[PDB]
Amino acid sequence: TKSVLFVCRGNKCRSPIAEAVFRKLVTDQNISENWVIDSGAVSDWNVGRSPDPRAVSCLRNHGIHTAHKARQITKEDFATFDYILCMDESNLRDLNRKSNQVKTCKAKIELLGSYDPQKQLIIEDPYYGNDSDFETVYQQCVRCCRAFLEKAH
């Protein structure tokens, strides 16, 4: 059983989209039973909130739905997930530092964009953008999630 946790700042725009995309992916590939998939936030500020309505609408445009509610990453997440894939360098920096402070870190922390065959390394925060920015994030997650499933690094 493999595990991936998608992380962003507040867990309402980017990482809920990545989670839903990857869940759709493994389901189509008929291997969802062998994958634990989740998303979480660095911050605790947005905990308990549903994804941004623009993220929900973006996923719906692509026939996807999510019932995720924002949660903050926990010490346990570092000890149990195989991969923690984050969105921007602020996430990476924060995750690398908290990884140092847990004596039981099994997860490999990487930028999700590190898997983009199109080389766009950063998945930028779309909250203060518009719906076309959520579509961009979605397209980034599709390319990155598919590359990740084919070969991890």
Residue numbers in the entry: 5 to 157
How is this structure described in the published paper?
The catalytic residues C12 (nucleophile) and R18 (phosphate binding) are located in the P-loop, and D129 (general acid/base) in the D-loop.
Enzyme kinetics experiments for the dephosphorylation of phosphoinositides reveal that the RT, RTK and RKK mutant enzymes show selective specificity for PI5P, whereas RK has a broader specificity, with activity towards PI3P, PI4P, and PI5P and PIP2, with the highest efficacy towards PIP2. In order to assess the actual impact of the designed mutations on the protein structure, we determined the crystal structures of the I16K and L13R-I16K mutants at 1.8Å and 2.0Å resolution respectively. In both cases, the structures are similar to the WT enzyme with overall root-mean deviations (RMSDs) of 0.288 Å and 0.265 Å respectively. There are no structural distortions in main chain of the P-loop or the variable region, thus the mutations introduced do not alter the tertiary structure of the protein, consistent with a catalytically active enzyme. In the structure of the RK mutant, the side chain of R13 points towards the centre of the active site interacting with a bound phosphate molecule and the catalytic D129. The new residues R13 and K16, both form interactions with the D5 and D1 phosphates respectively, and together with interactions with R53 they contribute to PIP2 binding. The crystals structure of R13-K16 design shows a larger active site pocket than the WT enzyme, which is compatible with binding of PI substrates.
